[PDB]
Design a binder for this molecule. Structure first.
Ligand SMILES: *[C@@H](C)[C@H]1/C(=C/C2=NC(=C\c3[nH]c(C[C@H]4NC(=O)C(/C=C/[C@H](Cc5c(/C=C6N=C(/C=C7\NC(=O)[C@H](C)[C@H]7CC)C(C)=C\6CCC(=O)O)[nH]c(C[C@H]6NC(=O)C(C=C)=C6C)c5C)C(=O)O)=C4C)c(C)c3CCC(=O)O)/C(CCC(=O)O)=C2C)NC(=O)[C@@H]1C
Ligand SMILES: *C(C)[C@H]1/C(=C/C2=NC(=C\c3[nH]c(C[C@H]4NC(=O)C(C=C)=C4C)c(C)c3CCC(=O)O)/C(CCC(=O)O)=C2C)NC(=O)[C@@H]1C
Ligand SMILES: *[C@@H](C)C1=C(C)C(=O)N[C@H]1Cc1[nH]c(/C=C2\N=C(C[C@H]3NC(=O)C(CC)=C3C)C(C)=C2CCC(=O)O)c(CCC(=O)O)c1C
Ligand SMILES: *[C@@H](C)[C@H]1/C(=C/C2=NC(=C\c3[nH]c(C[C@H]4NC(=O)C(C=C)=C4C)c(C)c3CCC(=O)O)/C(CCC(=O)O)=C2C)NC(=O)[C@@H]1C
Ligand SMILES: *[C@@H](C)[C@H]1/C(=C/C2=NC(=C\c3[nH]c(C[C@H]4NC(=O)C(C=C)=C4C)c(C)c3CCC(=O)O)/C(CCC(=O)O)=C2C)NC(=O)[C@@H]1C
Ligand SMILES: *[C@H](C)[C@H]1/C(=C/C2=NC(=C\c3[nH]c(C[C@H]4NC(=O)C(C=C)=C4C)c(C)c3CCC(=O)O)/C(CCC(=O)O)=C2C)NC(=O)[C@@H]1C
Ligand SMILES: *[C@H](C)[C@H]1/C(=C/C2=NC(=C\c3[nH]c(C[C@H]4NC(=O)C(C=C)=C4C)c(C)c3CCC(=O)O)/C(CCC(=O)O)=C2C)NC(=O)[C@@H]1C
Ligand SMILES: C=CC1=C(C)[C@@H](Cc2[nH]c(/C=C3N=C(/C=C4/NC(=O)[C@H](C)[C@H]4CC)C(C)=C\3CCC(=O)O)c(CCC(=O)O)c2C)NC1=O
Ligand SMILES: C=CC1=C(C)[C@@H](Cc2[nH]c(/C=C3N=C(/C=C4/NC(=O)[C@H](C)[C@H]4CC)C(C)=C\3CCC(=O)O)c(CCC(=O)O)c2C)NC1=O
Ligand SMILES: C=CC1=C(C)[C@@H](Cc2[nH]c(/C=C3N=C(/C=C4\NC(=O)[C@H](C)[C@H]4CC)C(C)=C\3CCC(=O)O)c(CCC(=O)O)c2C)NC1=O
Ligand SMILES: C=CC1=C(C)[C@@H](Cc2[nH]c(/C=C3N=C(/C=C4\NC(=O)[C@H](C)[C@H]4CC)C(C)=C\3CCC(=O)O)c(CCC(=O)O)c2C)NC1=O
Ligand SMILES: C=CC1=C(C)[C@@H](Cc2[nH]c(/C=C3N=C(/C=C4\NC(=O)[C@H](C)[C@H]4CC)C(C)=C\3CCC(=O)O)c(CCC(=O)O)c2C)NC1=O
Ligand SMILES: C=CC1=C(C)[C@@H](Cc2[nH]c(/C=C3N=C(/C=C4\NC(=O)[C@H](C)[C@H]4CC)C(C)=C\3CCC(=O)O)c(CCC(=O)O)c2C)NC1=O
Lengths: 177, 238, 164, 164, 177, 164, 164
C-alpha cells in the first residue's frame, strides 16, 4: 500500500508543503543503489522454500516442549499451520525490502495478530526465536557470507540494506508480544 | 484533564457494546446458522448441497479457506468496520419484510447476527451465483458483466486491497480454483424440482430489497433472472 | 496509493505468492524513467506561486460571469479561497510526479469530487479550463526535457479525463 | 499467463479504467531486461539435447534405487520417460525467458504437481536433483553473459522452490 | 490473458517445439518498436473522454433517429448506458496495442455481444457506424493529423502502427453485426 | 471424532430434530463388533519398540540414499526423529480401534499431512515403505484371528491410502 | 429416504470421501436387527382392513362431534376418506419399518403437515386419538415378539409427535 516514494509524500502532505529539490535528493539515493535493491531480493525469494523449513526445524531443537502432547506444534495438523503461519511472514517481509517502507507488514498481517495469539495460545518467546534465525539468514544471503550457495554478482556495498532488513525483521517481535 | 483510561486517538472498531455483548452477539449468530442448516440437511440427509470437499486433499483445506477469511475480514480499517455496521442495519432489515419490533432491536444492535441473517437467507433461498445458471448467451453475458463490476468494490483505485486474496500459502489458489468449477457441477441440477426454487425467488431477492424503483431492470429479472442473483449488491466489498 | 511498486506486490498478495522476475522487471522502469520523469518535480515546486498565479486568473480571465451577484465568486474571499483549490491540484501533481502513478490524484483529488461541487453550485468546467490553459505552456527550453514534459502532460490530462 | 505485461492489463480491467501512467513504466523496464535475457534463451535452444542427458544422469548417479522392481526407474522405457519430462522442464523455462516472467509454469507445470507425484509415486526429490545440476554449469566464460545468467538461474531455482 | 510474447509459445506446442533465434524475429519486431508503441497508447487515453464526446454525438449528427420518442437512446436512462457501451471499448482496444495481440477484446466483451444486443433491442446499424469513427480517431491521434490537438513527439513514422490499430478495430465489427 | 457414535448423532444435530430410530441400529453395529475391534488393540499395547525397530530401518534397508551428507538420516537422533514418527503411527491406530472409526487419525495424523513432509523434503512413500512391511504380519496363529485381522487392516490400509 | 444405509453414505458424501470402516460398522448390527425387526412387517399385511376398522370407529365414538354441521362426517364420503388415509398411514409406518430409517415417514407423511389440515379444517387432535387406540394394543400375549416391539410404538406416537 505504501512505499519509500510515498513516505516522503505523506510526510510533506501534513505540512501542506510541496515536494522540493533537497528533500527528494535523498529519493534518488534510492535510485543510486537501485540495482543493489534488486540484486538483493532474489537471494531471499529463491531460498524461501529452504528458509521456512530451516526455521521451523530450527526453533524446535531449542524448545522441544511444544512438540510434546499438549504443546503448540505437536500435531501434524498443528505443524501444518506453522508451515502456513511462518511462510507468509517471510512473504510479507520480502515486499517491504522492495517497497522501502515497513508498512506493508503493519496492515496485511500485524493488525489482528496479537489478539488471535492470546486466543490460539501461541507463546511469544518461541515465535521471535523463529524470526531471529531468519534475520540471520537474510543478512547471510544478501551478502555472500552464506552456508552453501554463493550468489556471485558484481560486489561492493551490501551492509546498508543489511541493517534495513534487520530493521524489518525486528518489528515482527514488536506486535508478537 | 486526562491521565486515566481515556485515549485521544486509539484504535477501536466502533460497534463494541461492552464485553458482555460480544458473547450474546456470537451465540445468536451461531443460532442463525443452526436455523439456516435446518433446510439443507433438515430431512436427516446431507444432500448433494453441502459438499465440503471434492477429493481427499480438497476437504480439509476448505476449512482453512474459511477461518483465514474470518481473519481477512477482521483486520479491516476503522472506516470499513464503521461502514458495514451501519449497512447491516440497512440490508438485513430488508430481509424480514414484516418490520416486527422484537427482531428490530436485536438486528440493529447485534451486527454479527445482522451479518449472518442476510448471509443465511441467501443460502436458504438458493440465490447466489454458486447456485444460478444461464440458458441463453444473452442470459450469459449480462450475468458475467455484473460480476465484472462486482470486482470494482475489491479494487477501487487500481490496487487489489487484499480482501480477495483467496489464499495465503504458495499453492492455495489452485486448490481454491477447482472447488469453484466443481461447485457449479455440484450445483448443476440439484433436483428435478429445482431450477424453479433457484429461479423464482431469484426474482424475489433483487426487486424487493435493492431497486425499489427502476422498472427497466425490474423487467430484466423477468427476462433474465441469472443476473438477478449474481448481482450481489449486499456490500461485502468483494 | 497506485505506485508501480504497489500494483505488482498486491497482485502477488492476491495469489499469496512471492515476488518474481515479473515484478523485478517493473522496478527497472522506475530506475530508467526517474532520471527524467521526476526532474520536472523540482521545477513545479521551484516556482508554483509564479505558475498558479497564471492558473488562478485564467479561470476568471475567461469566466467573468463568476464574479457576479448570485453566483460563486460574490465577494473577494470567494475570489481568494478559490485560488487554494487550484493550488491543491498542483501539489497533487508533483506528488504524483515522484511516486510513479496516479495514486494521490485519484484518492485525494477525484475521490468524492462529483458531489461537493454540484452541491455548492460550483461548476467543474471552471476547474478544468483554468488548468487546461496550463497545457499550452510546454516546450523543451526553459521548461523540462522533451521526454520529461510528456510525463507531466499526462498528469494534467489525467485530471481532465476524469473530471469530464 | 503471469507475465508483467499480462498482469497490469488485467489490473486495469477490474476497476474499469484505462492504462494509467504507472503500468506503462513497467513495459519500458521489460525492454531494459529483454536486452539481456532472450539473448540467453537461444543458447538453451541451441542445445535441447546436450543439457537433458546430464540432468538425466544426475537423477541416476545418486539415486541408484530406482532400478529395483516396483519403483520409478524400472526398465529403459521408464528411464526414457525420465528424460522427456526434464525435456519438458527445460522447454517450460524456454518459454519463461522469452515471455517475461513465471507465465507457463504456474499454469502448466506446478498446478497439479502436488498430486501427480503423490498418486503416481514419482519421487520429487529426484526432480530437483536434475535441474540443480543444470544450474551450476553457468560460468563467466563458456556460456551466456554475466547479466544473462541472472535470469536463467532465476526460473531454474524457482521451479526448485515450488516443489520444495 | 495473453500477449504477443505468449502467442508464439502456444505455436511451439502444436508440435512441442522451441523458440530460438529466427523464431524470435517475430518478437524482435516488437522489442525494437518499443518507444513507438508506448507513445501510441498514451495518445489514446489522454483524450478518450472527448472521443466518446465526439462519437455518439457523431451518431446523432449523422442519423438523429435515436432521440426519437420510441428510440433506443431516447432518455438519459438509455443515453448514459450508451455512454458506457462505447466507453469500455476504448479500454479494451488500448490493451491490445499494449499486449501486441488482440486477445483481451475477445475474452471479455465480444463473445456473444451481438446475441446480447438483439435481446436488448439494440439497433446494430448504428453500432458499427459509431465505432467506424473510432477506427479513424486512433489513426489520426497516433499521427499528428488532428485539427487543434498536437501531442508532438520525436520524429519517425507510426503508420505501420496505424495499420495495426485498425486490426484491433475490425474484430469489433464482425462481432456486433 | 468420526465414529459410529458422534456421526450418527450429528446426523440428528444437523436437522434440528430429535434422536431417531435410524441411530439405534448403528450403535448396535458396535455392540457386536467390539469382540474383535476391541480385541486387536492390546496386541500392540504390549508391543511398542519391537515393532518399530526392525521395520523402521527396513525402510533404510530398501533405500540406500537416506544416509548421505546433505540428506535426511545423517545422525542418530535424526534417525530417532525418523523412529518416533513411526512411534506416533501405531499409537494413533490404538485410538482408532477404541472410538468407533478412523476419527483419531482423521484429525491427529492425516489432516494437513501431505505438504509438511514435502516442505521438509522427505519421501512420503518411505513412510508407506514400512507399514506394508507391517501389514502382512497379521496371522490367526501367534496373534488374534482373521476376523480380528480385518480391523488391523481397517486402519493400517487407510494410513497408506492417506499418503497416496 | 433417510435410512441407516442412506445416513452413513450421505455423511461420507458430505465431505467427498471413501466409505471407511465406521460406515462398514454401521450396518453390521442390521445382521443383529433384520433377523428380528423385519418380522413385524407381516402383521399389518394380515390386518389390512381388520385393524383399521375397529380402531377408526372408536375415534368416531370418543370424538362424536364430527356429526355436527361444518364437520367432516356430514355424509358418507368422509366416512371412507378418514379410513383410507390411515390405510396410507399404516402402509407408510410399515414403509419405515421395512427400510430401517425415518425416510418414508418424512418423504411422504409429515413434510408439510402444518398446512394440509388447517385450510381443510380437519383436527390434528383426532390424529392423536387415531393412534391412541393402536398404541395401547402392543401385547406380546396373542401376538408376536417384543424384539420386534421395541420400535413399533416408538414409530407410532413418534408419528403423533411429528404431527404435534
Ligand atoms: C416479525 C417478527 C414478524 C414475523 C416474521 C416471520 N419470521 C418467520 C420465520 C423466521 N424468523 C427468523 C428469524 C429468527 N432468528 C432469530 O434469531 C430470532 C430472534 C431470536 C431469539 C433469541 C433466543 C432465545 C429467546 C427466548 N427463549 C425463551 C424461552 C423461555 N424462557 C424461559 O423463561 C423458559 C426457559 C422458556 C419459556 C418456556 C423466551 C421467552 C425468549 C425471548 C423471546 C421474547 O422475549 O420475545 N432463546 C435462545 C436460546 C435457544 N433458542 C433458540 O432459538 C436457539 C438457537 C438458535 C437457542 C440456543 C435464543 C438464541 C432466537 O434466536 O430464538 C428470530 C425470529 C428465521 C431464521 C425464520 C425461519 C425459520 C423459522 O421458521 O423460524 C415467519 C414464518 C414464515 C417462514 O418463512 O418461516 C414469519 C411470519 N413473524 C411475525 O409474526 C412478525 C409479524
Ligand atoms: C433505476 C433507473 C434506478 C437506478 C439505477 C442505477 N444503478 C446504477 C448502478 C448499479 N446498478 C446495479 C444493479 C442493476 N445493474 C444490473 O446490471 C442489474 C441486473 C441486470 C441490476 C439490478 C449494480 C450492480 C450497479 C453498480 C454497477 C457499477 O456501478 O458499475 C446507477 C449508476 C450507474 C453506474 O454507476 O453504472 C444508476 C443510476 N438509480 C436510480 O435512481 C433508479 C431508481
Ligand atoms: C453440510 C454443510 C453440513 C450440515 C448441514 C452439517 O451439519 N454439517 C455439514 C456436513 C458435514 N461435513 C463434514 C465434513 C467436513 N466439514 C468440514 C468443515 C468444518 N471444518 C471447519 O474447520 C469448520 C469451521 C468451523 C467446518 C464447518 C471439513 C473441512 C470436513 C472434512 C473433514 C475434515 O478434514 O475436517 C462432517 C463431519 C462428519 C464426517 O464424517 O465427515 C459433517 C457432519
Ligand atoms: C537452508 C538450509 C538454507 C540456509 C540457511 C541458514 N541457516 C542459518 C543458521 C541457522 N540455521 C539453523 C537451523 C538448523 N540448525 C540447527 O541447530 C537445527 C536443529 C536444532 C537446524 C534445523 C539454526 C538454529 C541457525 C542459527 C541462527 C543464527 O544464525 O544465529 C544461516 C546463517 C549462518 C549459516 O550460514 O549457518 C543460513 C544462511 N543455508 C543455506 O545455504 C540454505 C540455502
Ligand atoms: C508515432 C506513434 C508518434 C511518434 C512516436 C515516437 N515516440 C518515440 C519515442 C519515445 N516515446 C516515449 C514515451 C514512452 N516511453 C516510456 O518509457 C513511457 C512511460 C514512462 C512512454 C509514454 C519516450 C520516453 C521516447 C524516447 C526514446 C528515445 O527516442 O530516446 C519515437 C522515437 C523512437 C523511434 O524512432 O523508433 C517515435 C517515432 N512520433 C511521432 O512523430 C508520432 C506522433
Ligand atoms: C525416517 C524414517 C523418516 C523421516 C522423518 C523426519 N521427520 C521429520 C519431521 C517431522 N515429522 C513429523 C510427523 C510426526 N511428528 C509428530 O509430532 C506427529 C504427530 C503428533 C507426527 C506424525 C512432524 C510433525 C515433523 C516436524 C517436526 C520436526 O521438524 O522435528 C524430520 C526433520 C526434523 C528436523 O530436520 O529437525 C525427519 C528427518 N524422514 C525421512 O526421510 C524418513 C521418511
Ligand atoms: C379422518 C379420521 C380424518 C380426516 C380425513 C380426511 N382427509 C381428507 C382430505 C385429504 N387428506 C389428505 C392428506 C392425507 N391423505 C392421504 O392419502 C395421505 C398420505 C398419503 C395424507 C396425509 C389429502 C391430500 C386430502 C385431499 C385429497 C382427497 O382426499 O381427495 C378429507 C376430505 C376433506 C374435504 O375434501 O372436504 C377427510 C374427511 N379428516 C378428519 O376430520 C379426520 C381427522
Ligand atoms: C543454456 C545452455 C547450457 C549449456 C550448453 C551447458 C554448458 C555446458 N556445461 C558443460 C559441463 C561442464 N562444464 C564444466 C566447466 C566449467 N568451466 C569452469 O571452469 C567451470 C567450473 C564450469 C562452468 C563455468 C564442468 C566442470 C562441467 C561438468 C560438471 C557439471 O556439469 O556440473 C558442457 C560440456 C563440457 C563443456 O563444454 O564444458 C557444456 C556444453 N550448460 C548450460 O546451462
Ligand atoms: C497385531 C499383532 C501383531 C504382533 C504382536 C506381531 C507378531 C510378530 N510377528 C513377527 C514376524 C513373523 N512371524 C512369522 C511367522 C508366521 N507364521 C505364520 O504362519 C504367519 C505367516 C506368520 C505370523 C502371522 C514370519 C514369517 C515373520 C516375519 C515376516 C512377517 O512379518 O510375516 C514378529 C517379529 C519376529 C518374530 O518374533 O517372529 C513379531 C513380534 N505382528 C503382528 O501383526
Ligand atoms: C442451505 C444452506 C447452505 C449454505 C448457504 C452453504 C454455506 C456454504 N458456503 C460455502 C462457500 C461460499 N458461499 C458463498 C456464498 C455467499 N457468500 C456471500 O458473501 C454471499 C452473501 C453468499 C451468497 C452469494 C461464497 C461466495 C462461497 C465461496 C467462498 C466464500 O466466500 O465463503 C461453503 C463451503 C463449501 C461450499 O461451497 O459449499 C458452505 C458450506 N451450504 C449450505 O448447506
Ligand atoms: C456488463 C458490462 C457491459 C458490457 C459488456 C457492454 C455490453 C452491454 N450493453 C448493454 C446495454 C445497452 N447498450 C446500449 C448502447 C447502445 N445501444 C444502442 O442502441 C446504440 C447502438 C448504443 C449507443 C452507443 C443501450 C441503449 C443499452 C440498454 C440500456 C437500456 O435499454 O436501458 C448491456 C446490458 C445492460 C448493461 O449492463 O448495460 C451489456 C452487457 N456494456 C456493459 O455495460
Ligand atoms: C486534494 C485537493 C483539494 C481541493 C481541490 C480542495 C477541495 C475543496 N474546495 C472547497 C471549496 C471551494 N473551492 C473553490 C474553488 C474554485 N472556484 C472556482 O471558480 C475556481 C475554479 C476554483 C479555485 C481557483 C471555491 C470558490 C470554494 C468555496 C465554495 C463555497 O463556499 O461555496 C472545499 C470545501 C471547503 C469550503 O467550502 O470552504 C473543498 C474540500 N481541498 C482539497 O484538499
Ligand atoms: C508438457 C507438459 C508435461 C510435463 C510437465 C511433464 C509432466 C508429466 N510427466 C509424466 C510422466 C513421467 N515423467 C517422468 C520423469 C521423471 N521422473 C524422474 O524420476 C525424473 C526426475 C524425470 C525425468 C528426468 C517419468 C519417468 C514419467 C512416467 C511415470 C509413469 O509412467 O508412471 C506425465 C504423465 C504422462 C506421461 O508422460 O506418461 C506428465 C503430465 N510431462 C509432460 O508431458
Amino acid at each position: 500500500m505504501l512505499d519509500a516514494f510515498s513516505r516522503v509524500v505523506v510526510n510533506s502532505d501534513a505540512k501542506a508543503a510541496y515536494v522540493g529539490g533537497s528533500d527528494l535528493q535523498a529519493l534518488k539515493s534510492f535510485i543510486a543503489d537501485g540495482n543493489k535493491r534488486l540484486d538483493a531480493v532474489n537471494s531471499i525469494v529463491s531460498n524461501a522454500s529452504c528458509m521456512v523449513s530451516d526455521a521451523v526445524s530450527g526453533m524446535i531443537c531449542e524448545n522441544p516442549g511444544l512438540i510434546s502432547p499438549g504443546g503448540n506444534c505437536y500435531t501434524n495438523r498443528r505443524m501444518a499451520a506453522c508451515l502456513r503461519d511462518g511462510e507468509i511472514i517471510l512473504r510479507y517481509v520480502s515486499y517491504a525490502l522492495l517497497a522501502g517502507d515497513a508498512s506493508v507488514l503493519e496492515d496485511r498481517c500485524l493488525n489482528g495478530l496479537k489478539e488471535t495469539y492470546i486466543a490460539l495460545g501461541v507463546p511469544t518467546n518461541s515465535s521471535i526465536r523463529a524470526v531471529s534465525i531468519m534475520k540471520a539468514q537474510a543478512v547471510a544471503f544478501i551478502t555472500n557470507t552464506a552456508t552453501e550457495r554463493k550468489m556471485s554478482f558484481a560486489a561492493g556495498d551490501c551492509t546498508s540494506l543489511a541493517s534495513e532488513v534487520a530493521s524489518y525483521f525486528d518489528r515482527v517481535g514488536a506486535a508478537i508480544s | 484533564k486526562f491521565l486515566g483510561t481515556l485515549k485521544r486517538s486509539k484504535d477501536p472498531s466502533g460497534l463494541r457494546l461492552g464485553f458482555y455483548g460480544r458473547k450474546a452477539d456470537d451465540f445468536m449468530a451461531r443460532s442463525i446458522a443452526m436455523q439456516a442448516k435446518a433446510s439443507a440437511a433438515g430431512s436427516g440427509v446431507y444432500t448433494t448441497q453441502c459438499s465440503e470437499g471434492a477429493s481427499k486433499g480438497m476437504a480439509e483445506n476448505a476449512r482453512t479457506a474459511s477461518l483465514a477469511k474470518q481473519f481477512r475480514q477482521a483486520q479491516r480499517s476503522a472506516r470499513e468496520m464503521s461502514f458495514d455496521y451501519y449497512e447491516g442495519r440497512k440490508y438485513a432489515m430488508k430481509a424480514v419484510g414484516h418490520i416486527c419490533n422484537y427482531e428490530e432491536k436485536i438486528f440493529q444492535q447485534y451486527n454479527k447476527t445482522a451479518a449472518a441473517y442476510v448471509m443465511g437467507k441467501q443460502e436458504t433461498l438458493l440465490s447466489c451465483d454458486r447456485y444460478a445458471q444461464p440458458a441463453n448467451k444473452a442470459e450469459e453475458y449480462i450475468q458475467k458483466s455484473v460480476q465484472m463490476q462486482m470486482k470494482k468494490r475489491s479494487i477501487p483505485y487500481g490496487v487489489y486491497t487484499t480482501s480477495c486474496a483467496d489464499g495465503t500459502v504458495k499453492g492455495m489458489a489452485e486448490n481454491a480454483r477447482v472447488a469453484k468449477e466443481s461447485a457449479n457441477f455440484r450445483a448443476r441440477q440439484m433436483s428435478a424440482g429445482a431450477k424453479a426454487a433457484a429461479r423464482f425467488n431469484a426474482r424475489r431477492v433483487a426487486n424487493d430489497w435493492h431497486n425499489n424503483g427502476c422498472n427497466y431492470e425490474e423487467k430484466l429479472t423477468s427476462r433474465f433472472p441469472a443476473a438477478a442473483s449474481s448481482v450481489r449488491p449486499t456490500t461485502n466489498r468483494y | 496509493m497506485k505506485s508501480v511498486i504497489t500494483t505488482v506486490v498486491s497482485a502477488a498478495d492476491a495469489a499469496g505468492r512471492f515476488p518474481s522476475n515479473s515484478d523485478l522487471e517493473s522496478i527497472q522502469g522506475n530506475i530508467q524513467r526517474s532520471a527524467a520523469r521526476l526532474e520536472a518535480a523540482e521545477k513545479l515546486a521551484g516556482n508554483h506561486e509564479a505558475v498558479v498565479k497564471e492558473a488562478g486568473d485564467a479561470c476568471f480571465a475567461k469566466y467573468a460571469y463568476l464574479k457576479n451577484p448570485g453566483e460563486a465568486g460574490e465577494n473577494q474571499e470567494k475570489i481568494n479561497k478559490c485560488y487554494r483549490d487550484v493550488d491543491h491540484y498542483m501539489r497533487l501533481v508533483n506528488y504524483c510526479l515522484v511516486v510513479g502513478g496516479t495514486g494521490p490524484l485519484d484518492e485525494w483529488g477525484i475521490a468524492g469530487a462529483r458531489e461537493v461541487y454540484r452541491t455548492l453550485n460550483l461548476p467543474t468546467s471552471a476547474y478544468v479550463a483554468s488548468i487546461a490553459y496550463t497545457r499550452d505552456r510546454l516546450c523543451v527550453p526553459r521548461d523540462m526535457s522533451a521526454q520529461a514534459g510528456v510525463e507531466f502532460s499526462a498528469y494534467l490530462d489525467y485530471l481532465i479525463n476524469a473530471l469530464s
